Amino acid sequence: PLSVQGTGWMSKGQITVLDMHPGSGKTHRVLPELVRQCADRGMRTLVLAPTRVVLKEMERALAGKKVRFHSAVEGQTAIVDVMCHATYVHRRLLPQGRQNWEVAIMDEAHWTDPHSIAARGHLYSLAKENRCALVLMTATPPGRGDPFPESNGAIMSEERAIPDGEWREGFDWITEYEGRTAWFVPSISKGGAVARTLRQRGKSVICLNSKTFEKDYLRVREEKPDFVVTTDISEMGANLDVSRVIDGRTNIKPEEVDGKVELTGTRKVTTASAAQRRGRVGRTSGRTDEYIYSGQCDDDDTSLVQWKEAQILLDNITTLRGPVATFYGPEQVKMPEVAGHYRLNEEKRKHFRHLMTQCDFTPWLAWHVATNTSNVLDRSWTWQGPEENAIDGADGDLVRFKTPGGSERVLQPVWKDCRMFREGRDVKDFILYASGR
Numbered sequence: 001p002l003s004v005q006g007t008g009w010m011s012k013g014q015i016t017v018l019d020m021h022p023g024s025g026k027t028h029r030v031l032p033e034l035v036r037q038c039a040d041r042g043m044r045t046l047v048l049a050p051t052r053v054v055l056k057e058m059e060r061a062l063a064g065k066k067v068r069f070h071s072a073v074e075g076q077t078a079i080v081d082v083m084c085h086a087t088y089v090h091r092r093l094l095p096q097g098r099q100n101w102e103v104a105i106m107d108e109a110h111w112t113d114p115h116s117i118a119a120r121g122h123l124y125s126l127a128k129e130n131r132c133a134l135v136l137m138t139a140t141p142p143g144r145g146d147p148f149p150e151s152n153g154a155i156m157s158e159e160r161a162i163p164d165g166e167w168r169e170g171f172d173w174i175t176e177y178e179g180r181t182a183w184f185v186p187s188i189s190k191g192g193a194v195a196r197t198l199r200q201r202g203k204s205v206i207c208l209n210s211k212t213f214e215k216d217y218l219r220v221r222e223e224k225p226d227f228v229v230t231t232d233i234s235e236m237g238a239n240l241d242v243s244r245v246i247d248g249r250t251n252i253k254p255e256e257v258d259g260k261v262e263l264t265g266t267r268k269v270t271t272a273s274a275a276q277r278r279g280r281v282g283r284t285s286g287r288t289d290e291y292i293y294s295g296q297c298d299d300d301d302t303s304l305v306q307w308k309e310a311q312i313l314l315d316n317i318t319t320l321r322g323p324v325a326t327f328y329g330p331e332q333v334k335m336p337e338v339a340g341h342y343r344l345n346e347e348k349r350k351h352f353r354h355l356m357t358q359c360d361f362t363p364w365l366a367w368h369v370a371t372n373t374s375n376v377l378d379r380s381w382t383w384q385g386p387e388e389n390a391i392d393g394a395d396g397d398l399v400r401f402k403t404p405g406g407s408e409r410v411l412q413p414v415w416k417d418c419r420m421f422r423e424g425r426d427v428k429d430f431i432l433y434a435s436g437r
């Protein structure tokens, strides 16, 4: 790529967007050569991988005394640091983890996870302040997008009715297909239903989502399943080795409604997501791959809570001093409040980070708890909410738990986040924290 030829991309203040179409080799070949160019020249470099899977891939033939790796971490002891998007945010929530680099390279910089938005927002702000060089690598950069970008090989894109979960008759083209398929679903619940029918038809299935990706994605090339039923987690560099993509073009849609994070209905994916889902196939020029979709894209995702959670993380990995931080360029329009609105002190920030790393709290719930609570062992907010926030158990009844002293309470949080009781998270897990374990 022309922009990264020579050394000009290394100067402080330079922002390089490596937006090559999928299959160009940006992750496994262009990035390691960028890292090795930074390493043999003694420049402090930060490399951000989307997930731990890709981190260990990035590791191969790079780690040593030159490149120092991190699995969220908190250890201090190395000019090139390679870590995940969330690990970068989590380390900057610490006083001991606010180190800076003169060159920063972020792979899959399109990820709309709040940690990724805050990570590229902070690095973009540092680059705009002439304090580091920034390289963003993604086939779908933030901005205007094409749902059908170029591929290395031909893709047959055809609109078809796609089952909304299980199906009993019809949709024969699904099971007749000779080859492996990647089926994108809006949620884990929908993916479970799709997987039931597929296994009933005698097909091998591997389900990929936010909780199973780090462990099960490795089994895809090993076992070569007929179908990979995945959420949007596979839009960030996953090589599923399939010849057909089935894409309902929908996604779950966490929104803050009436001070509560709701999980109702689905939204049409953005043009960037559909391009990334379609980008799973056509990766080279041999055969003709298939992209079966349904519906049109919707780029207006401003109402999603991920943008508020991104500013929540960005405000707490930055400091009141100096210039105000922003989201990456075009995404700044979606910052819901003025920056710094969610900044907490060092004491509340440790509680804020503890709820996320040790209690699996969402950034939204972790912030609301940390900013209104004074004692980290106090759990009274979990049962002092309004009657509308009462949580039902697996049997549909009220969730009753005993505090360590003997008192019986009903799960009723002041701040209700529906993501804590479904989509990978179990209501039992919230009870362990509520009951004081």
Ligand code: NI
Pocket: 026, 027, 237
């Ligand atoms: Ni890639």
